[PDB]
Amino acid sequence: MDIVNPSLSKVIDIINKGKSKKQFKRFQSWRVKRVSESWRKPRGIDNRMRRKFGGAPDMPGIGYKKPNAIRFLLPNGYRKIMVACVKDLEALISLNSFYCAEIRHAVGSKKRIEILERAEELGILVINKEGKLVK
Amino acid sequence: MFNKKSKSRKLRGHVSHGYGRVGKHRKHPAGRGKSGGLKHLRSLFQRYHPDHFRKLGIVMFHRNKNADFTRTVNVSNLWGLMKLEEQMKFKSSAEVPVVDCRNYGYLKVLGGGDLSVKKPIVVIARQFTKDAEEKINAVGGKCVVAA
């Protein structure tokens, strides 16, 4: 869509290139199909990952948490709020400097048209703008 | 607080449910009820319950609670049986109050403390201690024994 928050425009690329792409897969989820990828802490008496031997993978923890200012920020430099009514946009009227709107999936075509018309006149960014309404 | 989550809900995912891996959780490792008390549990009894293993005292094969039931009041509380509005009348007034303990379900009078107001009073009851009698007579009151 190629849009950016004006307050961060000259900084956003540093921020984006700085985000981690680490994944914390569950131990041995690569060995048997019955174990999903979702993280669970290992609790075995012998387990090599719990005991932190070199060569085993890394475990999650507080050290990896991002700085408080950068956290929750989308790649366009805004935070997101969910909307499903015309009367929802009315809340964003004070916050449009830092927040943007994302219309919920279940809202149908006829109603979406009414949301977008209101978004234009109030000056609010909607990130699902194209959505289903491309046809 | 009026409501709180339980401990059992946090123990999901932890193997032994907090009973240990070596000790485990078996059915009855120590025996049932309060048994074993002269044997392997002797240390619990001698510490917390030393007068358990004994026979004691005089025996009556049938007793009647109604024939022996009683309730006791002290001299310092006599004026307190009256309502606060009533107290404040008899304090200034020239008349002497006549208090009957039977009416509040008291039958015996004990000698604890001093009388609230140092003016005469008539007290009706079934029994008085020697101290109680002396204290009431000290203020020029009267003790009346009644059934």
């Binding site: - | 120590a30 309060k34 549990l41 619990l44 319950h49 358990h52």
Partner: protein, 55 residues
């Protein structure tokens, strides 16, 4: 048995023991009301209850 307590004495040993619940309490109350009402018609001018002495 561990720690300090009043020594147990709970009588639940007998396997033939019956339990009685009271879910019927509001309904049986309503039936007793309706029986008194109809009894009161059968003898309309007269009180439902007799006179009794003081002892």
């Amino acid at each position: 048995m561990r720690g300090n307590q009043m020594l147990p004495n709970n009588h639940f040993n007998k396997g033939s023991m019956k339990f009685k619940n009271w879910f019927n309490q509001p309904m049986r109350a309503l039936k007793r009301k309706e029986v008194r009402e109809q009894k009161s018609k059968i003898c309309y001018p007269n009180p439902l209850k007799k006179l009794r002495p003081v002892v």
